[PDB]
């Protein structure tokens, strides 16, 4: 336990990790923390080099307050261990083997401090927040996306019809289901073509730029690039990728492709709950989010805050900051274990989805502010009058909220009222609000 080095002075170029460790009964913390570091980084060949130069080292332990068997072990890894511009390699090195160490009951990676000297080896987002608003010419309000349901079984032509109806109503984006790639019921090229026809028509009609997240996720890198190539030929603004199922190697290739060809990249987080749900084991979503900002994506599905306890809303906001801002000061209250400086790597727009209703508009606006995309499924598609009206409903609801806020109203205190007044002059909104009006009013 030449791996537990409380004397250690981290370097500016170190990669630091905060592991939530649940040791096996008997093994001391210090031994715990020294084991995380030991085969998280590292005979005669051993003397052909210097251990000390490439070893991860646990320079700090901390007892988790409340719990039994849990510490926060802080590990430092030398810059040299990592291949420049490779999230795949950062992940293999840090999380490749230790999660299976006998001596640990469970392990959870909570945070990583990516030093500026490593951040600079990544392209990061093809465009990022600022560039995207400017390319889309949209400022002053969260962006609105519509979810096309059902998830599978729709034809390419019906896909585009729902896409056109939803966009012409006031939403900025439509989204391919993360599962729609190319299938017997809908091959990708057919979808791309029809969606392109539908988004241009909705653009021409409303006078506002539209986008449809065309999913390029595919079986092979070649096929994924072939799909983004056609989106480029069609002249559309955004493509989509399922970064965890496709994988970091592919995602990094697509994010480069997007940068080189001017396409925005919408990232879906399918499969994340497999790794980031359990509090004692896995990788916290904030680590998955920093990795995405590094690999690249202009948008990332971040969950919803709708019906989340404040402590949760806080953890969420911590990772939102990590996604969007340039510098995030350490803050355990929000689950930020290290101060993260992004040295001007573009910020990613958080995408909020999952059960959002117009009467949730005030809070969402409030919590996320303008730099976010709010995505609705049942709210649009599920409106009594169809997709367009459904779309108006959300767009007026959002606009009512922004105006209110801009006028100095408290969205947290007056949410229901603001919504309710808007209903007075938006039939569309009125129709969306009826079941809610009855319960609250």
């Amino acid at each position: 336990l030449t791996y537990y080095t409380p004397e250690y002075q981290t370097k500016d170029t170190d990669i630091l990790a905060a592991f939530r460790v649940t040791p096996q009964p008997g093994v001391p913390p210090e031994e715990a923390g020294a084991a995380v570091a030991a085969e998280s980084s590292t005979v005669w060949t051993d003397g052909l080099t210097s251990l000390d130069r490439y070893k991860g080292r646990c320079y700090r332990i901390e007892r988790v307050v409340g719990e039994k068997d849990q510490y926060i072990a802080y590990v430092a890894y030398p810059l040299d261990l990592f291949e420049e511009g490779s999230v795949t390699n950062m992940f293999t090195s840090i999380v490749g083997n230790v999660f299976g160490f006998k001596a640990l009951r469970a392990l959870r990676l909570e945070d990583l401090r990516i030093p500026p000297a490593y951040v600079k080896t990544f392209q990061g987002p093809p465009h990022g927040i600022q560039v995207e608003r400017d390319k889309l010419n949209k400022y002053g309000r969260p962006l609105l996306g519509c979810t096309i349901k059902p998830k599978l079984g729709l034809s390419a032509k019906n896909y585009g019809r729902a896409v056109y109806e939803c966009l012409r109503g006031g939403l900025d984006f439509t989204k391919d289901d993360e599962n729609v790639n190319s299938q017997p019921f809908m091959r990708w090229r057919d979808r791309f073509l029809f969606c392109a026809e539908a988004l241009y028509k909705a653009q021409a009609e409303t006078g506002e730029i539209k986008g449809h997240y065309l999913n390029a996720t595919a079986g092979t890198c070649e096929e994924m690039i072939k799909r983004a190539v056609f989106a480029r030929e069609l002249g559309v603004p955004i493509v989509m990728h399922d970064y965890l199922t496709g994988g970091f190697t592919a995602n990094t290739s697509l994010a480069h492709y997007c940068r080189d060809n001017g396409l925005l990249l919408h990232i879906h987080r399918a499969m994340h709950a497999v790794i980031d749900r359990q509090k004692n084991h896995g990788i916290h979503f904030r680590v998955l989010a920093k990795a995405l900002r590094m690999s690249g994506g202009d948008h990332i599905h971040s969950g919803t805050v709708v019906g989340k306890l404040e402590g949760e809303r806080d953890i969420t906001l911590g990772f939102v900051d990590l996604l969007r801002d340039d510098f995030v000061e350490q803050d355990r209250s929000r689950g930020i274990y290290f101060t993260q400086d992004w040295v001007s790597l573009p910020g990613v727009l958080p995408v909020a989805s999952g059960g959002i209703h117009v009467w949730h508009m005030p809070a969402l606006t409030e919590i996320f502010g303008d730099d976010s995309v709010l995505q609705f499924g049942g709210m649009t598609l599920g409106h009594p009058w169809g997709n367009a009206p459904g779309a108006v409903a959300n767009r007026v609801a959002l606009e009512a909220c922004v105006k209110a806020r801009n006028e100095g109203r408290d969205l947290a205190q007056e949410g229901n009222e603001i919504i309710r007044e808007a209903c007075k002059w938006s039939p569309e909104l009125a129709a969306a609000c009826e079941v809610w009006k009855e319960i609250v009013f």
């Binding site: 608003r133 010419n137 989106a231 480029r232 002249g235 603004p237 007026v396 606009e399 009512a400 801009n406």
Partner: protein, 123 residues
């Protein structure tokens, strides 16, 4: 059950789905910019009120995003009224123009606000 019209519902981005801002609503918006310390600026256009794609069709290229600057960004202005004034100035001059107010956040070097302040007859 109502049908959203496919014609005559041309939009202008933020706040364009709400009823036309009143002089006071307008003023409130200007004041918000001011409260946050953004620099207001007017922009107007007389020909292409909407985005189009004449010169190029590659991803992210659109014509008509840029409008003409009305005078200069209003650095240091402290009275939301000065701004409303200019709007007034602009419409007398170009009654056929679309006029929008924009606000710069130079700390982040972004446009943090953009709404239509006046549309020509029939819009």
């Amino acid at each position: 059950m109502q049908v959203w019209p496919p014609i005559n519902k041309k939009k202008y981005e933020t706040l364009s789905y709400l009823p036309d801002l009143s002089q006071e609503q307008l003023l409130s918006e200007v004041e918000y910019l001011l409260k946050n310390g953004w620099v207001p600026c007017l922009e107007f256009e007389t020909e292409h009120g909407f985005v189009y794609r004449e010169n190029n069709k590659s991803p992210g290229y659109y014509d008509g995003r840029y409008w003409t600057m009305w005078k200069l960004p209003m650095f240091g202005c402290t009275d939301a009224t000065q701004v409303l004034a200019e709007v007034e100035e602009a419409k007398k001059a170009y009654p056929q123009a679309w006029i929008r107010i924009i606000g710069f956040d130079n700390v982040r070097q972004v446009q943090c606000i953009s709404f239509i302040a006046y549309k020509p007859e029939g819009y």
